């Protein structure tokens, strides 16, 4: 249906779906808008991000609940329990992987290559890193290794561009560094790198905070607070 829809209508419907807290619909409208093959605006990147993060966020939360139940059950080691939770965890996992694959598909087929500026390119590479990270959370074995590498590569490319092209207090740059630090700590079992990145990011942002435009001040200071909170947690 969506191929022939007016792009402007798809964006309007994404906004309506957001107001209605219909995030699966919102995501589908934004997928349709992306598939028109035009670059996204800032507002549209926000719509795309909010939609898919709500969907995958719900799935991640569900998966975590079920994985916990599954592991508790298995640990108890009763002769009669565990198959149903495993099956249902697998069902949710499959759905989560599907959404991540959709997002990564949009990034690879449309968004990364077609981005006309460094800021948006970094945003999309960050997003690629994030959705590989969400895949890594549920991956096992050798698949997990490859997925982790993919996340690392996307984040590293984003970091390299952001350091050359963007101020240290730019919200995209900050959000990328925060997420890459989380990757290091939670996924790559690299606490030293996580802490070093978070500390460097925090300090370099604080050093230039006095120059921040008012438009970004709230967002940048929020991310800096989260860096601080993670640093407190990790030390």
């Amino acid at each position: 249906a969506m191929g022939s829809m007016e792009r402007a209508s798809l964006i309007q419907k994404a906004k309506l779906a957001e107001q209605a807290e219909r995030y699966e619909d919102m995501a589908a409208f934004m997928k349709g808008a992306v598939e028109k093959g035009e670059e996204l605006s800032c507002e549209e990147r926000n719509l795309l991000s909010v939609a898919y993060k709500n969907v995958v966020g719900g799935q991640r939360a569900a998966w975590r609940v079920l994985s916990s139940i599954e592991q508790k059950s298995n640990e108890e080691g009763s002769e009669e329990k565990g198959p149903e939770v495993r099956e249902y965890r697998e069902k949710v996992e499959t759905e989560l992987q599907g959404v991540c694959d959709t997002v990564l598909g949009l990034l690879d087929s449309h968004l990364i290559k077609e981005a006309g500026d460094a800021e948006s390119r970094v945003f999309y590479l960050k997003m690629k890193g994030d959705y590989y990270r969400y895949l890594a959370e549920v991956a096992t074995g050798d698949d997990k290794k490859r997925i982790i590498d993919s996340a690392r590569s996307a984040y590293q490319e984003a970091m390299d561009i952001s350091k050359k092209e963007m101020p240290p207090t730019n919200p995209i740059r900050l959000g990328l560094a925060l997420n890459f630090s989380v990757f290091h700590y939670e996924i790559a079992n690299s606490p030293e790198e996580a802490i070093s990145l978070a500390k460097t990011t925090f300090d370099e942002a604080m050093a230039d905070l006095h120059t921040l435009s008012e438009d970004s001040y709230k967002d940048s200071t929020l991310i800096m607070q989260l860096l601080r909170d993670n640093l407190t947690l990790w030390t």
Partner: peptide, 10 residues
């Protein structure tokens, strides 16, 4: 407590 990533806000 899990580490906090970038929040899902505009």
């Amino acid at each position: 407590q899990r580490s906090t990533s970038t929040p899902n806000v505009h």
